[PDB]
């Protein structure tokens, strides 16, 4: 196989979506998906979304390098807070370009692997995998804990959008909090989508 583990490693590579200027991405490899060992989840500097890329097969990933520097585990500052945070419904507040408020209703999912001071989170108006250092925003008041409150991992998945065509994907993870909620990787995109499957 890979015969060396880049989980927890710093990576950098070019992004070749065309014959123009080629951006250079730096990032931290968060996980290698058990049900698809070619798929890696990566926290890229400057991206609020976790990215899923088959880092060694994708042609968009040019001149891929793995840095010798691993990222250590920065141990939990406020463990119980962090641990009571996981799974709650939250109000996340961001400043916009103007500087006016922008409040987003979401759910904290889990503690991010590798980058241990960060939390997986997704939002109602954008059900993809975000990643934020949520302790700061909570003590700053930008985050509000709201009081409102058979693993099919490894199976293929199909959606029907407006045109009525299959969107093929795979189930890659289950949230231990809220096991009815899952991570999905579609073939056509690098975003990790978050769905509540066992909903009825």
């Amino acid at each position: 196989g890979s015969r060396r583990n880049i989980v927890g490693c710093r990576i950098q590579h070019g992004w070749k979506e065309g014959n123009g200027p080629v951006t250079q991405w730096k990032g931290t490899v968060l996980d290698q998906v058990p049900v698809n060992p070619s798929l890696y989840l990566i926290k890229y500097d400057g991206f609020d979304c976790v990215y899923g890329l088959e880092l060694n097969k994708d042609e968009r990933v040019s001149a891929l390098e793995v840095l010798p520097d691993r990222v250590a585990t920065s141990r939990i500052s406020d463990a119980h807070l962090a641990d009571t945070m996981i799974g709650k419904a939250v109000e996340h507040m961001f400043e916009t370009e103007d500087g006016s408020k922008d409040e987003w209703r979401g759910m904290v999912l889990a503690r991010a692997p590798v980058m241990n001071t960060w939390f997986y989170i997704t939002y109602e108006k954008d059900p993809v995998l975000y990643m934020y250092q949520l302790l700061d925003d909570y003590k700053e008041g930008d985050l509000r804990i709201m009081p409102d409150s058979d693993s099919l991992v490894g199976k293929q998945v199909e959606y029907a959008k407006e045109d009525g065509s299959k969107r093929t994907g795979m189930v890659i993870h289950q949230v231990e909090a809220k096991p009815s909620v899952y991570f999905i990787k579609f073939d056509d995109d690098f975003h990790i989508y978050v769905y509540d499957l066992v909903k009825t």
């Binding site: 991206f47 609020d48 979304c49 108006k125 954008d126 993809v128 995109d189 975003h191």
Partner: peptide, 5 residues
């Protein structure tokens, strides 16, 4: 806006 719908 944001990241991917």
């Amino acid at each position: 806006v944001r990241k991917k719908r």
